[PDB]
């Protein structure tokens, strides 16, 4: 689990050979903290089968702008360069494993 830079977008994410789950957050949010723990847990559970990253849209707004992501927290699923699925609102750890498995 770690932040990603616009710089590191393509290499770390778009080039990643594993499926990628990215959390777009603003900062100093409570709901974002809760989603961030959910995602931490999913990353460790699926450690070495997917890759999981964070986008602090305060610092890398170009990434959200690129993917037309207007709400935080947002969880995005990227596989082989393309955006495969997006989850907003209330994020269900149960649903994220459902998808993580869908693309695995």
Residue numbers in the entry: 2 to 105
Quote from the publication.
As two substitutions (E54Y and K79H) appeared to destabilize edF106 and the optimal substitution appeared not to have been chosen at all positions, we prepared an enhanced version of MM9, termed eMM9, in which the best possible substitutions at each position, according to the measurements of single variants, were chosen: M51K, E54V, L55V, T57I, V83L, L87F, I88T, and P92S. Within experimental error, however, we were not able to differentiate the stability of eMM9 from MM9 (ΔG = −69.5 ± 1.1, n = 4, p = 0.30 [two-sided independent t test]), again possibly due to the very long extrapolations to denaturant-free conditions. The similar construct of eMM9, however, readily formed crystals in several conditions, with the best dataset collected at 2.25 Å resolution. The complete model could readily be built into the electron density despite minor crystal twinning present in the dataset that challenged the data analysis (STAR Methods). This revealed an equivalent structure to MM9 with all Cα RMSDs at 0.70 Å, whereas when the structure was compared with dF106, the RMSD was measured to 1.83 Å. Interestingly, the other main region of change is the start of helix 2 (α2)—the active site of the spinach thioredoxin—where MM9/eMM9 is again more akin to the natural protein. Thus, an all-Cα comparison of eMM9 showed an RMSD of 0.97 Å to spinach thioredoxin instead of 1.83 Å when compared with dF106. The structure also revealed that the destabilizing substitution E54Y presented in MM9, but not in eMM9, would probably be incompatible with the native conformation of Val2, which may have facilitated its increased dynamics following MM9 crystal formation.
